[PDB]
Amino acid sequence: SVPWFPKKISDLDHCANRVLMYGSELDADHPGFKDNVYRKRRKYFADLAMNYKHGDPIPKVEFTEEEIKTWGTVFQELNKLYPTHACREYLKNLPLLSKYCGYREDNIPQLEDVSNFLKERTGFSIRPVAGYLSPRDFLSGLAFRVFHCTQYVRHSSDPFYTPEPDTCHELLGHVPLLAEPSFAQFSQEIGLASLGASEEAVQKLATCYFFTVEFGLCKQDGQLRVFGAGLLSSISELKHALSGHAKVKPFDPKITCKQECLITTFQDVYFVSESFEDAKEKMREFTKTIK
Numbered sequence: 079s080v081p082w083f084p085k086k087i088s089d090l091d092h093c094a095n096r097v098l099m100y101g102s103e104l105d106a107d108h109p110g111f112k113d114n115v116y117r118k119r120r121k122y123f124a125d126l127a128m129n130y131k132h133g134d135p136i137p138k139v140e141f142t143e144e145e146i147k148t149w150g151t152v153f154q155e156l157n158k159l160y161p162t163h164a165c166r167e168y169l170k171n172l173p174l175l176s177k178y179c180g181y182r183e184d185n186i187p188q189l190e191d192v193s194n195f196l197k198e199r200t201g202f203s204i205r206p207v208a209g210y211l212s213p214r215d216f217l218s219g220l221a222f223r224v225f226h227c228t229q230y231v232r233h234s235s236d237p238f239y240t241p242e243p244d245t246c247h248e249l250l251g252h253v254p255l256l257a258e259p260s261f262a263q264f265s266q267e268i269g270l271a272s273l274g275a276s277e278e279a280v281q282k283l284a285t286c287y288f289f290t291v292e293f294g295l296c297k298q299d300g301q302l303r304v305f306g307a308g309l310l311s312s313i314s315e316l317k318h319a320l321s322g323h324a325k326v327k328p329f330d331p332k333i334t335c336k337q338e339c340l341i342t343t344f345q346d347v348y349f350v351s352e353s354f355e356d357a358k359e360k361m362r363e364f365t366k367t368i369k
């Protein structure tokens with residue numbers, strides 16, 4: 079039978095707290111694993127998300143000088159790379175965020191402000207999330223153009239620490255493309271396809287999501303460009319993805335969904351979409367075969 083799925087945006091209240099791994103549950107190898115102050119801070123953030131209910135303004139956070147410096151370091155280095163690496167759409171929307179949401183080296187944008195910006199641009203909004211959700215619950219947010227979004231900042235000891243999302247990843251990797259109508263439609267349709275789908279189908283949709291939204295490449299005016307958020311917030315892999323050292327295959331959901339999603343290393347392969355519109359068309363054909 080069909081598993082429960084959210085029927086309206088406020089129904090995400092009922093699954094967004096189904097957290098499998100809380101954000102305060104640091105990995106053994108986490109840079110902050112032995113840092114008690116950081117652990118409390120991570121608790122503070124997880125509790126903010128847990129207490130959030132749809133309709134709430136997303137709580138504003140006073141980031142510490144240390145957190146802001148970490149953001150600044152990440153922001154400054156990535157922005158050197160974006161003009162030669164990022165896709166059309168990303169480069170078009172990034173300056174709008176500097177103008178209206180306070181994206182600057184010395185200021186971490188607030189999720190509420192970013193959410194309000196996205197609502198006007200594409201109907202996308204942000205929901206703070208305590209930690210890891212099932213693929214089903216995470217993707218279901220996208221059906222209502224809701225992006226589940228971490229609010230904490232990576233540990234300052236390693237501004238280059240990438241195997242968990244932090245708010246640097248969300249704001250620099252995800253948000254500029256959620257502001258693009260073609261991409262917002264593509265993302266929403268992943269979520270819509272996932273609603274009430276089989277466990278098998280959800281897993282395949284999650285893998286397609288991974289190799290587009292998180293690690294996707296696209297071809298634009300004959301050039302390979304980056305649109306994956308995991309790449310756009312990782313200085314080293316951003317460079318690697320467009321070097322000659324990377325293996326690239328065309329995006330093709332029936333083949334892409336067989337690919338293992340790697341966590342603690344660079345991906346072994348990247349998938350190239352022709353455009354957001356083509357990727358959307360390919361998913362539509364694919365979802366008919368699994369749902």
Ligand SMILES: CCn1c(=O)[nH]c(=O)c2c1nc(Cc1cn3c(n1)CCCC3)n2Cc1ccc(-c2ccccc2)cc1
Nearest residue numbers: 099100101209210211212213216240241242243284287308
């Ligand atoms: C469809 C797969 N998928 C899922 O099934 N469920 C998700 O919850 C999910 C997700 N995908 C992303 C977003 C995400 C995950 N990652 C990145 N973005 C960047 C590259 C590192 C991994 N998330 C959100 C998310 C994932 C992990 C955490 C987390 C936070 C602290 C400690 C451990 C884990 C918090 C939020």
Ligand SMILES: [Fe+3]
Nearest residue numbers: 243292307308
């Ligand atoms: Fe992400």
